Design a binder for these strands. Sequence first.
RNA 1: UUACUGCACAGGUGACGA
DNA 2: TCGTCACCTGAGCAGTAAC
Length: 758
Amino acid sequence: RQLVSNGFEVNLPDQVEVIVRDLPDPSKVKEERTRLMGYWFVHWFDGKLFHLRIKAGGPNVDGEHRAIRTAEHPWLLRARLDDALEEALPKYAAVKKRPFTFLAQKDELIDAAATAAGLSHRLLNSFKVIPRFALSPKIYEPVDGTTRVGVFVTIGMRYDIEASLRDLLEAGIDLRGMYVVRRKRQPGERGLLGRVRAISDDMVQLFEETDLASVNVNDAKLEGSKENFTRCLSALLGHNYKKLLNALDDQEAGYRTGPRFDDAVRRMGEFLAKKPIRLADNINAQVGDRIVFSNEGQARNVRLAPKVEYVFDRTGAKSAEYAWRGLSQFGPFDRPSFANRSPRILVVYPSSTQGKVENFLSAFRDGMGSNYSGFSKGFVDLMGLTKVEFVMCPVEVSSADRNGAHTKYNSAIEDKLAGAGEVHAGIVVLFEDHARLPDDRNPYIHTKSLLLTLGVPTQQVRMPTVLLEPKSLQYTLQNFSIATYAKLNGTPWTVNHDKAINDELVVGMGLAELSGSRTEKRQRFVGITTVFAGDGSYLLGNVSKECEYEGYSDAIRESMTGILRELKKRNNWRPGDTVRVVFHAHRPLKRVDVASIVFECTREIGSDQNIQMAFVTVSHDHPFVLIDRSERGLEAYKGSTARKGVFAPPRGAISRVGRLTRLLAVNSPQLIKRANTPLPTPLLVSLHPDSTFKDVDYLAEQALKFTSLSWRSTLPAATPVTIFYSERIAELLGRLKSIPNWSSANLNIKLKWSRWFL
RNA sequence: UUACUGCACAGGUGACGA
DNA sequence: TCGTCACCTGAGCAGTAAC
Ligand SMILES: [Mg+2]
Ligand SMILES: [Mg+2]
């Protein structure tokens, strides 16, 4: 019963002696840190400046001489550890600080992968993939009431294209439209310069420039994106260049797969544990045992949530460990009541794809047959419908048309619908060359707009998807079918819920950030999604129609109180019943907004019931990882010597980091794709400290179940649907806000029960 | 824009303080 | 205005679909 972390205990002194002085204006801190540099470690906290002597000798420092006990106030030494870790690795230059981040000294994976693939080119040496390590001192709590500091080791890869732009152009690479960044970024200076128009003298001409429209070939480099790597390498090598990428992926697997990551962390620890770490010239620390999550002793730090159940009726009796297995066997959760058993579906597609579209449609509606067990039955039989009528809407448009495609799609739709009575959904087929045009000429968003205005949800699809090989096509049709049925107001499946309290509501908010280009300030938009407890089941409620970032706290409030009102009427709560409201987002709410939300929900539900509220953040990007040494992994594909998921904790593993924080494992070996896939990073689930409901284990389990609620796919989602759906909504509504002739009027009328955002 | 995985780079940004 | 600790979202890339 044990999970291992990527962290080491740091054994610190009980206490440390310090000088303090009030400094209520923190503008002074920077100049004072400079003045006392080398003799003093300095730290501002709660309107006071704390000074720790590191070397003997001046300057002089005036203040109170107090002792800071590490058990009570671990922040002081946690902070000094940021610098001390750097000073403990003097041969490695910091590429970043706090956390100390640095590069492997010898290791360089493109050279290694080139050799491995037997590939060569004169400029390869100037494309660099270097392992990047970071050491993060973090406060954790083995047991409640006791804090410790750990040093957590993370590994990524620095991708950089050192090559001069002249050398790249002279080697035959078309730099037109590639992004370029500064070779040297001055203090607090913007890296991104813009896009390459052309090169004249010693000078790059930029468009979509961030500052000046020009820069010297020598001050600029290609940005280290995957786009610029593939663009350069395909030109210099292709289409062998894939093989270089696959060998590069093998090289990285040497650092990031479970056993290899565990080893790199061990080796890092061994190194740091070699000597004491100098906190000051008379004060030392020591890197100790690897931090573990277990229930040995007084610690209760790891549990395994039960497997999520996909449920397909109200009786609980029809359930399955996996969405598709369940859907196939049972059909959808709502088939007994599903009102519209003969849907009419508008199919909008370029006239020249007619044949390819008809085949796709036949496979969709009528299934692919018993040779493709992944999608045999087809939509009609899969969902328990009587039939699907297609209303074909060819459009006279070519893939080469970049400027009028959206006009052509929309005229065709309007013309076809005027004669064709009521359609219940649409399928819109798009050319790959049109998919990501700017929104003023983008047929996805324009047809989405027109049809949602008219109250018709759409499921769009790009031609490469339409043309997929049968083995791939079956999984596509599973997901396309699930979203389509939900777009028609269907509920494909629910997830199991153990009836605890008299009612439970979960609301989530999600963010989208929109601009036409990288030069243009991104504008924020929001979405709000609601999920209610049912009997044995979690049910999706209503979704926001306004996407307003300013005032989002009011919107969360408004949503919660409105819904609490409806739940009380529906369920007729009895005096003494308890109601639980949970909020989910990828960022924490302000204390003042938690206060306002609690205040209002409390008032709305009244004195007859008890309220419990939790405010949860879900984090994907933090310094923790969990390692399960007993997990042997699975066949990457049967029955190969190579394994995938080696050392990956099981899905639903929940580890305790601190009173407010749990780590949740989501991607088990079964869900991992490839032998080369790194050891997964778990979700960090964090409870807002003003929450009145405190069981973060239950909340972590709840977040996990809500990952299995996504009707965008058969496979589970990366974040609970409360947040995920809200993000999809935020992006769609925010984009639509700029599309002429868009009206949200039908979103709460014809589309009220449509999952139109999937 | 069937999706999942989430890499890489960029933009920066949030919360808490006083 | 600031210090401090922390990490979220968009673009484009590439491989795979929980028995
Ligand atoms: Mg979709
Ligand atoms: Mg990442």
